Amino acid sequence: FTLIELMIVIAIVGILAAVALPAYQDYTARAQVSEAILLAEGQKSAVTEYYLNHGKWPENNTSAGVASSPTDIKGKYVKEVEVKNGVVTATMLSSGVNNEIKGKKLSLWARRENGSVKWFCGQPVTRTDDDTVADAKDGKEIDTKHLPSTCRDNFDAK
Numbered sequence: 001f002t003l004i005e006l007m008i009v010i011a012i013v014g015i016l017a018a019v020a021l022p023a024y025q026d027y028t029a030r031a032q033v034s035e036a037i038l039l040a041e042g043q044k045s046a047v048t049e050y051y052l053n054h055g056k057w058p059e060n061n062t063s064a065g066v067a068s069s070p071t072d073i074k075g076k077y078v079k080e081v082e083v084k085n086g087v088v089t090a091t092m093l094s095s096g097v098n099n100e101i102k103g104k105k106l107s108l109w110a111r112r113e114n115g116s117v118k119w120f121c122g123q124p125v126t127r128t129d130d131d132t133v134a135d136a137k138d139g140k141e142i143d144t145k146h147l148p149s150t151c152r153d154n155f156d157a158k
């Protein structure tokens with residue numbers, strides 16, 4: 001009816017928002033990084049086979065038998081996915097991505113189980129030897145808060 005009554009509603013409605021978005025902004029990013037992960041996976045098939053058939057991790061996308069160009073394995077929030085010695089790292093785009101996750105990435109690497117291998121998912125890693133990787137510490141890793149509970153693996157997870 002009156003002006004002020006409206007301002008209260010508007011103030012009320014507007015306060016539930018300011019309060020509620022630092023968590024939607026995260027549900028959001030946590031949704032986006034969740035795909036960088038789905039695009040990262042599916043590259044496991046290629047990579048696993050290459051390793052088991054040859055006993056050497058595929059050096060790049062072409063070796064693993066996937067889109068030779070990493071930029072062809074891109075998405076909406078994913079600007080690409082590159083295989084670097086069995087390690088598959090997904091990168092977050094720069095257009096259409098939260099704010100503190102864009103340009104950031106995660107990695108998926110595996111480990112010789114002997115006759116088979118086990119996969120890990122976590123923050124950017126680099127392969128050292130056929131059975132050892134390490135934190136690709138550089139400052140572009142997707143922050144722990146944005147990663148699922150299933151993608152919290154450390155460089156030395158076994």
Ligand SMILES: *[C@@H]1O[C@H](CO)[C@@H](NC(C)=O)[C@H](O[C@H]2O[C@H](CO)[C@H](O)[C@H](O)[C@H]2O)[C@H]1NC(C)=O
Nearest residue numbers: 050054056057058059060061062063064065085
């Ligand atoms: C695919 O991954 C292989 C991993 O073993 C890698 N081999 C080695 C020994 O690193 C392949 O590279 C070889 O084959 C290419 C073919 O053009 C090229 O001749 C390289 O010199 C050779 O090492 C990887 N293939 C590619 C295309 O890089």
